Specification:
44 residues; little secondary structure; Laminin; 0% helix; elongated; Protein jagged-1
């Protein structure tokens, strides 16, 4: 069901660390943040 690019207690995280700092994501290896955040990594 999932293993590559999906960690966590079960499966609900595309490891935002490697490539980003905060925010969310729905696909493997991606970066999704708000508009206030600048840059792909979406940091402060």
């Amino acid at each position: 069901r999932c293993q590559y690019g999906w960690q966590g207690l079960y499966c609900d995280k595309c490891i935002p660390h490697p490539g980003c700092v905060h925010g969310i994501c729905n696909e493997p290896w991606q970066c999704l943040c708000e508009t206030n955040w600048g840059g792909q990594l979406c940091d402060k």
